[PDB]
Amino acid sequence: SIINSLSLVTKSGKYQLGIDKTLQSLRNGEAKLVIFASNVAPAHRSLIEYYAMLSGCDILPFDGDNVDLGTACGKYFRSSVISIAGESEILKMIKQ
């Protein structure tokens, strides 16, 4: 359901892809929502939700592994976290 948007995210605007990039984006107050995998590590999973609360940045915990969230964007490798200028298709509604 949400992969319909997340395909068009790659077309529309810029996005970060992993834990090093997403934490730099959250520190700057730049990233406006962020998406977990199921199997993201229990150091980073606790830490990323903390900065998302502090920023006022929206959270979308996606069921399915880093394999599924990797091939959601289309690229042929495993990605635990994707954070995300210009929305793809109304992400205000679809996150809820």
Partner RNA sequence: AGGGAAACUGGUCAUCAGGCGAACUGCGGCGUUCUGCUGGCAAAACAUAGCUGUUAUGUCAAUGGCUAUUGGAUUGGU
Q: Which residues bind RNA (CB under 7 A)?
A: 16-22, 39-41, 44, 66, 75-81
Nearer to RNA, 34 or 91 (CB): 34
Nearer to RNA, 48 or 96 (CB): 48
User: Considering only CA atoms, which of 51, 53, 58 is closest in space to residue 27?
Assistant: 51
Taking CA atoms, 36 is separated from 6, 59, 76, in Å, by 13, 8, 18
Give the bridge partners for 59, in sequence order. Answer: 34
Nearer to RNA, 76 or 92 (CB): 76
Tell the smallest beta-carbon distance from residue 90 to RNA (Å): 26
